[PDB]
Structure 1
Amino acid sequence: MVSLPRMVYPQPKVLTPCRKDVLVVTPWLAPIVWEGTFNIDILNEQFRLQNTTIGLTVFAIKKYVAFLKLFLETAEKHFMVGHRVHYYVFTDQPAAVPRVTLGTGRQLSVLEVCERRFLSEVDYLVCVDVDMEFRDHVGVEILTPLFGTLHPGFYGSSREAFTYERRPQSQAYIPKDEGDFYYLGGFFGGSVQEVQRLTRACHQAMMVDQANGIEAVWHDESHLNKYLLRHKPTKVLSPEYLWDQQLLGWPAVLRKLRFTAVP
């Protein structure tokens, strides 16, 4: 809304692509976020001017409460640093949640296991798994009305290979000739409104399947892929945002491993 201040930085080169080894924009013109595609300084400016508040949700149940400490600490070093952050930890063990020191402007809410709440406390919801750790920068370059992340195991495969729900009896069914990408169920987000619409669409889809006595091959992840097929995300994060180094190594194509799994 408000204008940006004087800024000095490398002039974008029209005849010089940033990256030439990967697709940096989808067929529906949504950027695909890769290191080297964005100037964080510009993006930080734009989002700070709007005093943007990002909500980060995680569900730590049972033995998973153990990953909270590493998760929160690493997030404190790489997640939306400089912006307002609100962590929402949904757990079945409120007292097991570790006491993590948070930077200023960042807070944490423990929810023992409504929506209207999210609409008033944050501008964006980022939803991920807890058994993870941040290893590098994960910032506002990902914020958009709706985004999904490319699965680290199929980002170089053809649709026919994707592990979509192939049974026509499931609401998550996707034929072999349909599909843009295979998105990860453990890293998606967008505005509060768009994220609730997605989760509401999936919950209903999952009920219909249960009533029909069937469960999608990859559960939640199967429905997400179906919803994102019909509602193209406004931004797609590259595999840099969710990788398993132990299981997949470190390809030259990935200049950074931002969010990874904890062996």
Structure 2
Amino acid sequence: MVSLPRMVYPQPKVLTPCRKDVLVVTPWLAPIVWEGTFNIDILNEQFRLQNTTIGLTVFAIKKYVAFLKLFLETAEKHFMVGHRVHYYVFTDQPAAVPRVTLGTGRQLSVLEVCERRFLSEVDYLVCVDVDMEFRDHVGVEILTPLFGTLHPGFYGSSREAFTYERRPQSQAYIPKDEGDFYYLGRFFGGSVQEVQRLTRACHQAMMVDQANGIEAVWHDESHLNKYLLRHKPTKVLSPEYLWDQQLLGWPAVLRKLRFTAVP
């Protein structure tokens, strides 16, 4: 809405690609977020001027509650710093949630295990798993109506090799001649409306599958891939956003490892 203020930064170079080792835009013109493609100062200004609030949701059941401390502490250091953040921790052990110190303008809600609530409390929803830790910047550059994240183990793979559900009897079915990328089932998000739209579709498709006595090879991830194939994401995050250094090392194509699994 409102105008940006005067800002001093390097002029974009029309005749100089911002990364010549990777694809930075999809065939449907959605940017693929890699380090070096964005100026965070410009983006921070745009989103702060809109007083953007980001909801971060995580489920922590049973032994997984033990990962909450590191998850939240690192999120405090790297996730949407400077912006309004609302953490939503869904757990079966409310009293076991760690007492983590939060920066100003950030809050945490513990939900024991109300979709309308999201619509009134946050502008965007980011859905991830708890057994992870932030190691570098994860900010507003990811915000968009709907985004998926390139799976770290298959970003360089051909579609035939993707572990999509291959049985036609499943709602998540994707033939060998279809598919753009293999997205992570544990790092996606977008506007509340778009995220609820995706989860609602996934929930229904999985019910149809169980009624037909079939379970997708990679469960929710298989369905998320089917959804994003038919509903193109408006932004796609590079593997920088969900990496496993123990299993994959640190490739030259990765300038930053922002969010990683905890061994």
TM range (shorter): over 0.9
The structural deviation recorded for 1:230 is 0.2
Q: Deviations over 1:57-96 (max 9, x none)?
A: 0000000000000000000000000000000000000001
Match of 2:76 in 1: 76
Q: What do the CA deviations read for 1:23-72 (whole angstroms, capped 9, x no partner)? A: 00000000000000000000000000000000000000000000000000
Q: Map Cα deviations across residues 213-252 of structure 1 (whole Å, 9 max, x no partner).
A: 1000000000000000000000000000000000000001
- For the residue of structure 1 that corresponds to 2:227, the secondary structure is helix
Deviation at 1:255, TM superposition (A): 0.1
For residues 195 and 119 of structure 1, the distance between their equivalents in structure 2, rounded to whole angstroms, comes to: 11
Structure 2 unaligned residues grouped into runs of 5+? none
What is the DSSP-based 3-state SS (H/G/I as helix, E as strand, rest coil) of the residue aligned with 2:136?
Answer: coil
| Aligned counterparts of 1:188 and 1:3: Cα–Cα separation in 2 | 30
Deviations 1:167-222 (A, max 9, x none): 00000000000000000001000000000000000000000000001000000000
Structure 1 length normalisation: TM-score?
1.00
> Counterpart of 2:5?
5
Distance in 2 between residues matched to 1:77 and 1:41, nearest whole Å: 17
TM-score when normalising by structure 2: 1.00
Partner of 1:35, secondary structure, is coil
Q: How many Å separate the matches in 1 of 2:72 and 2:40?
A: 22
The number of equivalent residue pairs is 263
**Superposed displacement of residue 18, structure 1:** 1.0
Q: CA deviation at 1:133?
A: 0.0
**Matched residue of 1:183: which SS?**
coil
Once the two structures are superposed, residues 104-133 of structure 1 have per-residue CA deviations (whole angstroms, 9 ceiling, x without a partner) of: 000000000011000000000000000000
What are the ranges of 5 or more consecutive residues in structure 1 without an aligned counterpart? none
Which 4+ runs in 1 deviate beyond 4 A? none
What's the counterpart of residue 195 of structure 2?
195
What is the DSSP-based 3-state SS (H/G/I as helix, E as strand, rest coil) of the residue aligned with 1:59?
A: strand
